[PDB]
């Protein structure tokens, strides 16, 4: 729906349902500034926005050497339904180095939204951060505002002139409740279930990030289930024309306990090339390289040589979700890997 919610400093630290209002807080702020906004405010105009060249910096050793984000870009993060996903969307939290964060549950069972508010509890980063849910027992046009009301804080601090992250967790429930709401309203099913409404309603939401000629920016990470393929499910291939890029998350991989589980095959950072420097996309292009190659101990016979590259590159690759490493140290440690 059309709707206007609250937006400030005072938010910081709460936790807000799909009218507004708060009802919980993983934080305390000083500050108590609360204004009343309007919730579906249209993208910057392209001569407001600045270009994308300073990164956005993760502490993920694999997106940061080889997905690199940009400040204001909008990424995908495509995963079937777990931890994985939520393992990763931590540590983004945790390790990156935004001014603030706001996080936007939208469709998820009440444990999951719990689940979350206690991680931020034990953030460093809570002072920080809001939170926006709307778990599935709300209705259809309540799950839509979430977005939207997440959205619309992220840019009030945008206009204030922050390094703002925004996380849409489901972005195909967001778009799932956008059609129970115009299949209510009484439209026509065109793609596949989705009246041609929603679909045309996604580029606005998915174009108000990122970055300012003024100053302020919002990084946007947006979630996409994977359930079925491109045909059954039309999002993904929407929402990858309209994105700067995506994360996918690997089943194989979690399957077998590599986290994060990232395919970086199946990944890519659009925005690559412009905000890492030439030294960076050759080590980078090596290393996928040798990725490709080891496709290709246990414990005293020299094969012992195979296993110890297989063993750093599977090092360099897992991460422990309690660790952030910054742009030298990963790029040392992806160096010390290719010589
Ligand atoms: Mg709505
Ligand atoms: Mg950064
Ligand atoms: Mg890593
Ligand atoms: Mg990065
Ligand atoms: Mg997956
Ligand atoms: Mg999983
Ligand atoms: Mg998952
Ligand atoms: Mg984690
Ligand atoms: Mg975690
Ligand atoms: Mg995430
Ligand atoms: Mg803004
Ligand atoms: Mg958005
Ligand atoms: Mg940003
Ligand atoms: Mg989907
Ligand atoms: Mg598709
Ligand atoms: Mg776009
Ligand atoms: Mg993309
Ligand atoms: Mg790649």
Known sequence: ???????????????????????????????????????????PLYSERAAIEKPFLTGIKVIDSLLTCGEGQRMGIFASAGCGKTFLMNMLIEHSGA???????????????????????????????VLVYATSDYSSVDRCNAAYIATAIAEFFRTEGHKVALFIDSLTRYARALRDVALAAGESPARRGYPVSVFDSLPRLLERPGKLKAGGSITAFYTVLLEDDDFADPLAEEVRSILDGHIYLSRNLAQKGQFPAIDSLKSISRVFTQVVDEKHRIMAA??????????????????????????????????????????????????????
């Open 286 to 339: 090596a290393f996928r390289e040798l990725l490709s190659e080891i496709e290709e101990p246990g414990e005293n016979a020299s094969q012992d040589k195979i296993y110890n590259k297989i063993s750093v590159v599977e090092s360099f690759l897992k991460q422990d979700y309690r660790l952030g490493f910054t742009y030298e140290q990963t790029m040392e440690l992806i160096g010390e890997t290719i010589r």
């Open 1 to 43: 729906s059309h709707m206007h919610t609250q937006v400030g400093r005072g938010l910081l630290g709460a936790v807000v349902n799909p009218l507004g209002e708060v009802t919980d807080k993983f934080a305390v702020t000083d500050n108590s500034e609360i204004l009343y906004r309007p919730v579906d405010n249209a993208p």
């Open 99 to 129: 001014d603030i964060y706001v996080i936007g549950l939208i469709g998820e069972r009440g444990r999951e939204v719990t689940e979350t508010v206690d991680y931020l509890k034990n953030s460093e980063k809570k002072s920080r951060c």
